Design a protein around this ligand. Sequence first.
Ligand SMILES: Cc1cc2nc3c(=O)[nH]c(=O)nc-3n(C[C@H](O)[C@H](O)[C@H](O)COP(=O)(O)O)c2cc1C
Ligand SMILES: Cc1cc2nc3c(=O)[nH]c(=O)nc-3n(C[C@H](O)[C@H](O)[C@H](O)COP(=O)(O)O)c2cc1C
Ligand SMILES: Cc1ncc(COP(=O)(O)O)c(C=O)c1O
Ligand SMILES: Cc1ncc(COP(=O)(O)O)c(C=O)c1O
Lengths: 199, 199
Amino acid sequence: GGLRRRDLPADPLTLFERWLSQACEAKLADPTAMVVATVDEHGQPYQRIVLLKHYDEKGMVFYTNLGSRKAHQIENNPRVSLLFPWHTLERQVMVIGKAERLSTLEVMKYFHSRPRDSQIGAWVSKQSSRISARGILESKFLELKQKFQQGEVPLPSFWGGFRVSLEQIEFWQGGEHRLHDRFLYQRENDAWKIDRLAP
Amino acid sequence: GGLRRRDLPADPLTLFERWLSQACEAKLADPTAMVVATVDEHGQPYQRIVLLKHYDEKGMVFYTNLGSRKAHQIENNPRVSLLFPWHTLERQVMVIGKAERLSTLEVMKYFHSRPRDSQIGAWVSKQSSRISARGILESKFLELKQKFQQGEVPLPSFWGGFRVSLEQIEFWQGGEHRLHDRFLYQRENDAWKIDRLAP
Ligand SMILES: Cc1cc2nc3c(=O)[nH]c(=O)nc-3n(C[C@H](O)[C@H](O)[C@H](O)COP(=O)(O)O)c2cc1C
Ligand SMILES: Cc1cc2nc3c(=O)[nH]c(=O)nc-3n(C[C@H](O)[C@H](O)[C@H](O)COP(=O)(O)O)c2cc1C
Ligand SMILES: Cc1ncc(COP(=O)(O)O)c(C=O)c1O
Ligand SMILES: Cc1ncc(COP(=O)(O)O)c(C=O)c1O
């Protein structure tokens, strides 16, 4: 019970790892689910949940449709925010950094790993665009589910991924009487500067 | 099972209400918890969870410390995003609008309703600012817990609230084979324009 500075690891990822791990066993729904916030050209923020798929010193990775809104927004402003809503476990992890596209080699590797039906589904949806009916989706799906016959199901060209850099990582943990613990790890030079923040 | 346009209510709030209600009985942790995203002066988005406290045609309300980061950010850019992470129930509700300060009369009304200890706590924390030790919080708290003796516990002047307007409301509900249902309600003139969006 409690979050004291003296217990903090030098690498915020160590702490994130332990927290991610504990969330998984705690059986949280989609412990890897995180809210990614992006900003459009008019300064208006936008949010949606995506799944964390990989992470290391280079940043956190998620995959998405390259014609989607989050994608157009990242292209005009690569500054993003990630928030892991683990409040059932009285925790929050917020990441701040820049989103950079993944090479086709990486994207390719991950795509040919997800459920065959999900690969077909990736083809079906022109993510974020306005469609006149649900049926359009259902048609295309069956029209491909068999057209591909599953021969391998090709990687759609409009399917990609992003790696968000770690410029800042904030940890929040529930505190009694409303006094929560907050620590901000801030990438500075070749290291991490840590500061406690008032709740 | 399924989210069809023909079943949509004319007022997005009707749907939000039903969804909020079902989440509560489903016993989700903090069904009222939502992630509010704001943007700083450099175009960098920021996120944190806050609790929805009231909502109506005028917008959604939450309270916070007026010296906090979200507050400074709203002052420079009132465009915000709210996301209710109800993915355990395979749902998402995203709200887009402008944040406007609540009058002292409203703030006052709500403040003198929360747990006495939370009112004391509101005084203790200079939210978001860097503090050198947790003890600072704990000291101030006890120093006030008794100083106020609970005489009424005055409303701190640095304690306020915001009402986010409803310019857009998006509903997302889990879909089979990766084909989720998405509907965007867009405030237009004196009404709501509804469009289905590709998943
Ligand atoms: C638990 C969960 C996981 C999701 N994961 C992803 C993901 O990894 N990639 C993705 O593109 N969309 C994902 N979505 C759907 C997105 O929230 C969103 O609807 C979509 O990416 C389009 O957002 P955009 O229009 O802002 O670009 C997920 C939704 C939920 C509730
Ligand atoms: C379930 C939950 C509810 C919270 N509700 C609020 C709230 O209503 N108001 C608030 O100021 N902070 C709330 N917080 C703490 C915020 O997430 C955040 O730490 C704080 O407002 C400071 O953010 P800022 O530095 O971006 O301004 C809550 C955290 C959790 C996990
Ligand atoms: C639209 C969409 N794309 C991508 C993903 C994540 O990739 P995968 O389906 O391989 O888990 C999800 C996960 O819920 C999703 O809903
Ligand atoms: C720092 C902080 N301020 C305000 C609130 C919400 O107001 P209240 O404590 O009256 O529920 C919360 C709720 O978790 C909180 O954590």
